[PDB]
Amino acid sequence: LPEHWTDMNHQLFCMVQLEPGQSEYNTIKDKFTRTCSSYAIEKIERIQNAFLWQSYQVKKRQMDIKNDHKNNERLLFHGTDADSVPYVNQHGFNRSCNAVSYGKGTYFAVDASYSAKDTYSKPDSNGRKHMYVVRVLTGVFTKGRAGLVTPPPKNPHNPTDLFDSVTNNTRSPKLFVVFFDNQAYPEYLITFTA
Amino acid sequence: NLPEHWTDMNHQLFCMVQLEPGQSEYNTIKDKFTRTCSSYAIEKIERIQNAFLWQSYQVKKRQMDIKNDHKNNERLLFHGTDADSVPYVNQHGFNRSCAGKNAVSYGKGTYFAVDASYSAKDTYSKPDSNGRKHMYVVRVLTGVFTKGRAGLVTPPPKNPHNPTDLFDSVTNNTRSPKLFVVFFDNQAYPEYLITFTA
Ligand SMILES: O=C1N=NC(=O)c2cc(OCC3CC3)ccc21
């Protein structure tokens, strides 16, 4: 389990509220405020989910072998409604659960501002919005298209050797779509307001 | 962590191994199959050695074994499919996003049968242009299960007031289970591919 995690008293799930002004809080706050400096942060919580982390690290080791190099991982944003937060904290991201123009997967934004739209981070009855900071195994990617259920093949002559993810634009990506469980680890939950 | 009876794959991550009749491994799968499908004949039985699917599956099994209270979480079940799906299942396993609607739906997931006779239906194991039918024998993490419902995209909660604490799978009938539905990747390991004909 990672260094920066705090002790869980032999439990396998904890949401840990970060201390404002310490290094970890400042790093995550800066990634958000790059594009969302007009929003008010109520809190940032570290997601310590041992089972999700295990399953994700296994996928990461496998993708590092398959792709014959590292650099398979990116930090991305995911806005969601308050009713989905408990599910994501416990079970992560489920493609089976908005527009799906680049395929039937889970969508992650490069910019917090994109995930901050009310259609994604729906304001709850008290006006609070929720956005995850997500470790995503984007790996080797191609342009997506409507109706994909998995990424395309890297060569139609080996139809089972797939891209790891798809994007809106391969030269200047602003979103990524992954199509498999455990390709995304929800690392921080930001609670914020307009 | 690959099983010690697998054949050497020489740094490769995937191998299909043809089993020999007379070996206990071939004969127990043949018996499991013929118990309900004695009218069909087996062409061959291949052991699926997929290092990546095995690792992800064994991680999910250890997690369910920890979470559940000394349960037998794992059953050996059947899955009939078309020849066009065999290369994908062999490499990537069972994808709920590719699943057909079942004639009796207990949820939107991947279906597994207790009896080979059910998977032997032409609806599931579609005969290819040479008349070969294909059925996987599958390690499935059924865990703790309940009767499913056609609307499900995940197993239901055990308790409505704790919506995130889920059953592991659903069935058609908890007293006499004949099918299981799983809603997550890496909850099933395709262990053997049976090729068979009328
Ligand atoms: O942050 C997000 N949370 N949920 C989404 O569905 C989502 C979707 C998304 O791109 C969808 C548009 C059609 C290409 C971007 C971000 C998010």
UniProtKB/Swiss-Prot annotation, chain B:
Mono-ADP-ribosyltransferase that mediates mono-ADP-ribosylation of target proteins. Acts as a negative regulator of transcription. The gene is PARP15. This is Protein mono-ADP-ribosyltransferase PARP15. It comes from Homo sapiens. The chain holds residues 481 to 678 of 678 of the full protein. Residues 2-198 form the PARP catalytic domain. It is found in: Nucleus. Changing residue 124 to C: Reduces catalytic activity 20-fold. Abolishes activity. Coiled coil: none annotated. Belongs to the ARTD/PARP family.
